[model samples]
Target: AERPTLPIPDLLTTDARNRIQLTIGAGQSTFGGKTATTWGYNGNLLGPAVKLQRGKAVTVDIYNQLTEETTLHWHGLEVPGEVDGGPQGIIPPGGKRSVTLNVDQPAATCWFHPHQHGKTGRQVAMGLAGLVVIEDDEILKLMLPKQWGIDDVPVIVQDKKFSADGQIDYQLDVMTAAVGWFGDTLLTNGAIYPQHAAPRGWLRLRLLNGCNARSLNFATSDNRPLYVIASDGGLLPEPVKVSELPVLMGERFEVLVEVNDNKPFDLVTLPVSQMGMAIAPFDKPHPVMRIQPIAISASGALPDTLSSLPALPSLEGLTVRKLQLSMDPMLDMMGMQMLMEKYGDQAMAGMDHHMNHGGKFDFHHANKINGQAFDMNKPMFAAAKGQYERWVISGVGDMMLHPFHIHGTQFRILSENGKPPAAHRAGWKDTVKVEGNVSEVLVKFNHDAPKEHAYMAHSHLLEHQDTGMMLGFTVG
Candidate 1:
């Protein structure tokens, strides 16, 4: 069987009157020769790349066509919390929300997805994410593959397990609820084991880890080095060449790969068990996509430096804060079992319990930060607007991987595991991987968000987020 060509989503620019209509609806997508009912924006499995220019204002009119309510969130865009689309911004079925954004951030590869309360993992796993590619004068002047869908392509990598007939299997078992879901099948832009025809000698791939839990180790089958040029918040100080780049959940990386020959190579992932536990074999390589190199009229070389990033904010007299992340799936399940023995199914209604065919309760409510579950009515802390602070996040009891993400502003990683971050992780970031027990960041809230619609800091593992390992804080 011939492999399917990679799906290139239509680039919806904020040009042409500075307006983009994002209509979300139900759709069908075929993967591995089977079709699955999915949700998307406009009319596809995933949403379009809504291109934004730095300093230009654009209005997004979101029309919710799905039967259920969901919020359209711009994941890494440095917009205000009122429009950042956290759990509070819900677009009811047939409802509409108009967001006008005049962002002032550097060029970055950000993304959007549903961020409604408790069901973020479900909605995002069902194909409800898209890219928000921002460009600036510096990015336009760089000597790289600036074009889209030719040399520059979008790699929205996701994993999915399908039923016997190809519907997305969302039925979570015990460990999946505890550790987060991992799929046996991998996908790139909603296609199973797809292939891309790359033009020119240099190919720039904008990679987004759209998975619910699985972290990724992106590399090439030929062991060729990849030049990392950008992070979640944009271009780095320079390109860091490495053989493998570890991309955690909710992180975006823009890497440049050089193909000097016509021979195609497989874009693959080596085993990276950053999670506390593993289900699949953690020592094997998995094929992601086959890149077929094609000669084209346009080509470019990798520059020595991508961009000169700005300096960090002053660190003097910064308010220091600490957060402890912890999870206990077994304990949560035991409590659920005891409740079932006492109050029956009614007691399990509000809890994170799902009944399987065997009548066993599946668990996903064992995650927390600051020792408390996510409460919609409660604000964890408060930050004065434009106040810089130092934050230290660590995992307690277990060395699990939690990619820490904050809303509304881009932060700089000061250190990870008590050491300096890797060169690829030295850029401005909205999400930093909390490896083992310690990750430090310099954060500031530049925008005001009311307590009713505050921003969040949480584990980017979608299941962990949906469960309870999330906190909301107001910036005023």
Candidate 2:
């Protein structure tokens, strides 16, 4: 296959007073000389880049041109539950929905995608996603790459599958839904094996793992150090140097790279084994993109410090909650066997049994939180408005990794398995990885959430999310 040219999404227009108008609709495009049906905002394959400044007011005019209903979710934006575009923020077929709100969070690389129940994975796989860049005065003072599509670049990495003739192929089975759908080909910004002529200087790469299930271990081909500057929520307190970093599904990271020569360096994704088992079809490292600087250019030096994060709020007087991420069959069978052994056959026979038609366990309940599947009508947790709470989210009985995400508000990770979080995860985040151990985070609902329109917290693995590894909560 020929190397694809990188595509830059068009920027939305804004007025002189900072008021913006965004019109997004679904459409189709041809890829690799074949007509592949897909959905996007304003364009064919993927949506355009929507930028906003902190403290500015913006209005988005959304249109659902597809045959079915869909909701446009602001992945990391801390808007209200009603406007956050959760399951309740649905737009009917050919319907129009407008959203106006004030941008009140830190500058970060967020995104927008479809959040319809049972269809999120499929819709996103067919290309219904885009990137949003939030800027602030604090970050403007930093000496970093600010040019778009040149020194500063947006890299949206997604794993996908295609037919031999170049058409997209989507196959979802029971096993894939229970675990995840792994793709055979990798894409960066909708291009397969794209290459960019980077400027020889300090550059910023905003990386977003748009994959549905696969986790990426990002590193350079030469194993050079990747300087980390920002995470999911925004810039870190300071830069942390690391040889590699893990970016799970729906997670984003901003890193600064220095190019001193014209030697081309390859950015690759190494094979990631969950616990010990390798995810099928993607158990090998693959080159995602190549950066070849054309010529040396003038650039600024990276600051020793970035931003000052808020102090960890005191845990005093806050309610603590414990939640578990569990796998099916084995854990459920263990519970049933314990009851049968202790309470006799009578107890086992009297218990309610929901079995999988021919399989060992019910596929309907394969992935769960607190032993129950996702219920849009139920509120798993009720939080008081303006009150702080501690959530201890853990993965039990299995070794698979889950990129847990919470809607409506950003949080600070307190600890992971009783120890402090890693350098990349020490800052503010809306999503965190929970696997092999327990992870605790301190959160507060800054916006009002009524019972009818609650927020969601679930696994970012799209297949798992659609299969019921999610829950709703309200804050009022």
Candidate 3:
């Protein structure tokens, strides 16, 4: 199939009262001349880009028009639990909820998506996601590309599989769900094989890895260096030029590309084997979007320093905790073996393969955190409201790369694998990819979470999250 021009989502309108109204509804969209049913925030496929300014008091009313219940989560925002849109903040069918946000974060690219238990993967795969661009005075002073939808673009990348009639196929068997769903096709900004025409000079690309489980290692086709100006939380101290960067699920990166040459450059995802696992499908390089620049145009130059980061918070007298990520295939195998021992092999021979208990061939053991599955009622730890702690997150045994994400607060990476963090991870981060090593991070929560309302920390892979590789913590 030929690639289509990338589509820019429309900006949401603000009323005179300075309130934004977003309706969560379902619609139909045509891909490759075949119609597919999709759920979006406002229109068909995806929602509009919502622009929020720092220090502003913003009020948003979300109306749920879907037949079932859903909760809208502000993925990287540091809101209180009541308005954080976790599982507790659900809006039933034909119901609406209003939330007020006190925007205090720096300029960065954040997003909103459904975080409801057991439905996050399905709802997000069906296209219930949108971008939230937070702006601040410090970023505006840089004088970068401020225009929306033209020079400054939002690149929401997702992977999907299609049925025979061109509909999105989300059929997840036990084995597939174990490793998370890997799509056969890539969609950039809701268009398959997208291409974007760029003006010469510098172009700011807000790269959002919106896939359910896929991690994108983005690089230019010609191996041109990409200037990374900002990371998940906000602007870096200085722009770091690199060949490629790994953007995990629910992660975002702001990169600057100098389109001085007239030749078109393709932004591609290089093959990356997670934790040295031989997943052939995810180990192949694929083009995400093509950037064809027009004639050279005059663009403002970037400053030597993007933004100054504050000193790391004092870890003096802070408690440190160790968390582990591993798999337990033996447990599932043991259960199956016990079942076979109790019932004769011949007696179980007629049982359907799909109906087997404890997962098919220990598939449920693909991912785990803290040796337990996700239980909403169970909290892994409890911390005081004003306590500072260091968390050592490590990947143990036979596990691939896991993009660890913590809700409610953004943390600072102290070290990775017992060494200093990389340049890209030096700033505040809400999610970090951990593989074959340990990541030490300083965490402090400003909001309080009682027993009934808690924060989540888990693998950003939606499949992993939906299936049990997640934990909750109380900050009170």
Candidate 4:
């Protein structure tokens, strides 16, 4: 099919019901005298901003114009099962589906994207994604920067690779199966080298690391510490000033910066060494995007408290579930060396096997819960309405990081590898990255959650989740 030429969405306003039409196809562009095709929303790449209220009924009319079938899942929103738009809710080619959602949560930032089984990574990479902002009365009155498109910014950071003809190339081979593919060019809000003007005082920055596989180390151009106001899920209990933040794919960071100088400052992410070696030459840093500082028009102090978050719900009496991850023998130290020697120029991507719960089990072949692969048709773990539970996730394989995500409810990290969680992670979180070995989390199922909303729990990694490495839990 021929590509489409469409403009990106910058502003959005939705009333009781809204109609949004999107076409999935290649996006044509020219850069440096070269023509290219990108995947976009509404038109070519990336869809529009789907703004919604906290307790409003919304009808999202989604049409799958692509050749293949796709589904639109509202990530992190309280929606019904049919409207959730996972693999089960497939929108056939040239077909349309209307997702009716009545959001009942406080103010939060959520996203919508394709969730077709085995095709989410490719479809999302091709641009079928959009932003959903849930507004509340409390967050609207905060003293933080409120100038939309002027000061407050929503930055969707994505990496894309272009073919010689300027077409977005999808890596279906094993190379992406292993380390993941990253585009040389970085895009924010669907534009390359995007620039924004900021007021001299404090500006709210909501950052989405929408890359497929790459991890980013974010820092200021001058190495100054950025004040972090919130992380994934919601605002932190207290502010934290950190020089750097390592955000993996599918993560979000909300920070406040004071541009007292009104000078041009850059938000830079350290580049990963492309030499394919543990120790390579140090490379220069690249900017995530540039912020042109503007003179302060008004002087106002930030509130002592930003937002009043609900206290951590107790999980003291709930049942506990433990999951362990182990890699295949083909991915062991000797196995990797042998494969590298055998296939000198074409090493396979991803190891042959991965076991969960214990070494005797294979998670890829069997999605298990409590030493057994999960049966989606059957309930792996069931909780009574309004019950709380604690889950411990451990990696038995080589050094690997996995961000465990739960649907419908947010959670708090109780410990990591048997040690206490960091101070920055003391509050609520919807996803938590379990490093190397083991990590534990405490979660409570809010009484409002229904069977449709009861579906929860999975790895945040797109590759891992689509594969058999994920298990679902139910709370009623």
Candidate 5:
């Protein structure tokens, strides 16, 4: 059987008046030649890429056509909280919400996903996500590949688990709940065993780690070098080459691959044990996609410099706050007890599978940040308007990996593990992985987030975020 071609999501260009209309709906997609039910922004499986230009005002009309409600959170775009879509902005079934905001941040690869607090994990796993490609004058001036689906490509890699009959099964238990979800099958753009036929020369790849819970370490099967030119926020000062790149949930990286021949290569992830831990099937390594390079020159030379970002923000007299990405044992126990009471014997059978796979109820089930779960009714704290503050993010004990993310602003990591971040991570970022040590970032609420419409800071692992490891704050 011939390998399927990678599906390229159509670009939803803004109208003359800079308006984008997106509808959240549901459909079915065949993965590994098996049909499964899924949901998306404007189609059956995933969503179309929304092109957002920098410094221009774009109005988004989001219509929720799904049977249930969900929120559309712009993952990394720095906009007003009213349109931020953190958990507070709920679009009811068959309801609509219009949001207008000026895109003032740098041109970067951002994304949109459902962020309805407790419901995010399931909704996202069912296939609701899209890319927000932001462009500016500087981006146009750069010598990078600009053609979409040809030289430049968008890769949204998500893992999934299917039943014997190909139905999408999203079941969780004590151990699976404590540890995040990992799918035995990985999909790129809703296609299985997909292959990308690329033109020769410099090929730009906009990579997004779109998994709900599993984190992945990406590398080429032949160990070819990948030049990382941008982070979650925007372009780096220059390209940093690496053989393997580790990515966590909700993370985005723009890398360049030099294709000089027509040979085919596979993009695969290392085993979870290489970075963290996982169960039997989930612990195994998997393929992301196959890149087949064509012997045609459709690209140009790579740029030495990508961007000229400003220096790090000043920390003098900045209001400092600490956020503990932690878990509570007592809370975990109580939560499991409640689950048992709710599901009865069925819950016990699920727990048995979890235990047999080395899944144990632990403190991780609490999913607490600063000893508290996400509360929509109240904002956890208040940030001074337009004031840059120091955010010290930490992890409790030897926790696996928690990709910490914040809304409304793309912060700069001041330091990681008491040392400066590596060259590739020196670029602007909204999500940073915190395992055991610490990472400090300088964040600011440049836009107004009124008391009612606030922002959120939490782990990017959707399971953790939906459970309790999230905080909310309003910028006055």
Candidate 6:
């Protein structure tokens, strides 16, 4: 099988005023003279960009055309849980679900993907993902460059491991069970050796790292600082330039680039770096993709000033909740053997026998918050409908980077290791990196809590998530 692209059907676009339909499936493709198996929305790989305007209501009809059940989860949208598209929102094979997206937030880049329980890691790795752009008046009014599909671009970087037959193999075994699979092949927007042209002058890029456990250590191949203007949620208070940055799973970064239309340049991501070392054997430093200079446009202007998000409101009277994560190898070791016994020989074969010898498993499932797994029916903590709360997260052992993510609302990093906070993190963020063993952060619940809003908190490491290391909280 080879990688395929899922372009919107032309026959179904007769009355396209404002509609987006996504079809999920598996397909084949030939890249670099080798056939690569792939999956995506409408194609052999991920779907194309679906752009919408802020304040406009978007109605997307999603058809799960694959052999397995799949549902689209709006990763950053603040829609109701019913429409948020979690595990419970699966669209059975050959079935469809209509999602009405209310785009009231600021202009930002988001993504959609299969959110079925226990399969998110596998399905996403297979290529079922795409970019969603929400435009706004404030952004339109900015001086930023706006040459639609030309100056502004969306970049998605991922790793795909292949077999001798050039097919993606997801065989769950001991090693894979301990640590999620790492790939040798790299991809950008489902294309190998992808290239995009940026005209002379300034260009904007929306970067999303949708890899299951790959933390992208990104920098320009030339080693120049990448001017970051926004984050997972939206624009930063001010532009922060840096030579290298790390983006974990489900994370987003917005960058400003100035390129000479006639001179070719490349936007590079160091997929292999210590920043992503939790999974081991980091990616190499090379151009994951390339950027070619296109015809220069004279009419478009790049904005010096971007729309700013409101200041981080004071945390007066905000209750504080503490979540502690730890790894108890002895417990997990016994737990795994017990699981094998209960599940019988078939499950025992899948066990990573090597881990049991050391009495230290992968720590994927054993690392937990408040000593529990993610249960949709359970609540870790409860808050009043309109109250604000601060969450403090700390690792019980080891030096690991945990991409902490929450549902329902985005948050501001109050401080990192007691520092003022990273300049790049001062924005609307549904996820933040907790370095080492301790971190303190705060968030407010705007949606009706308790009843109207059911939020979740967890490590964004998809494999760890599937194994456990996730919990839910409420506001009401």
Top lDDT model: 1
What digit string (tens of lDDT, one per residue) describes model 6 on residues 65-153? Answer: 88889768777766666567766677899888887777767777788787776667788877888777777877666656555556666
The residue-by-residue lDDT of candidate 3 on 55-143, one tens digit each, is 88788999999999999888888777778887767899999999988877888888999988766888998989998898899888898
Error of 5 at 23 (Å): 1.3
| Residue pairs in candidate 5 whose N, alpha carbon or C atoms collide under 3 angstroms | none
After superposition, the stretches of candidate 1 with alpha carbons farther than 4 Å from their true spots are 15-17, 275-283, 332-365
Q: How many Å off is the CA of 234 in candidate 6?
A: 1.4
Number of clashing residue pairs in every model? 0, 0, 0, 15, 0, 25
Provide the RMSD of all predictions against the true structure, rounded to 1 decimal: 6.1, 7.1, 6.3, 5.9, 5.3, 6.6
Of candidate 2, the 10-residue stretch with the lowest lDDT total is 346-355
TM-score of each: 0.91, 0.89, 0.89, 0.83, 0.90, 0.84
Give lDDT tens digits, candidate 2, residues 1-476: 65666777766656675445444455555655666666677777777778988998788878788888888898988887888887888889888888876788899999999999877888898888888899999998996788788878898998777787666777555555644665666778887778877778787889999988878888988777789999888999999998898888998899987776757888888777542113333445678888877686837557999999888978988899888887776543554454346435443231224345564365555778998788888989888777779998998666566888998877899976557989888897888778768889988878877767789999898877887788889888
Q: Give the C-alpha miss distance for residue 304 in model 4, angstroms.
A: 2.1
1-476 in candidate 1: lDDT tens per residue?
87788889888886477789999999898877788999999975788999999998899999999999999889998878789899999899999999998878889999999998988988988889999989888888886797788888999998887889889988444455555766778889888778888875788999999999888889999998899989999999888999998888999999999875578899987777543212343236888889987776456668888888778777788998888888775644554465346435543232222335441222455678887878878989987788788999987466556889988888889987678888788888988877566888988787888888889889888877887889999988
Clashing pairs in 2: none
Q: After superposition, how far is residue 182 of candidate 6 from its true place, in Å?
A: 1.8
lDDT of the candidates, in the order given? 0.82, 0.78, 0.78, 0.62, 0.80, 0.66
lDDT of 6: 0.66
lDDT of 5 by residue, 20-77 (tens): 9999998888877778889988898889998888878888999999999899999999
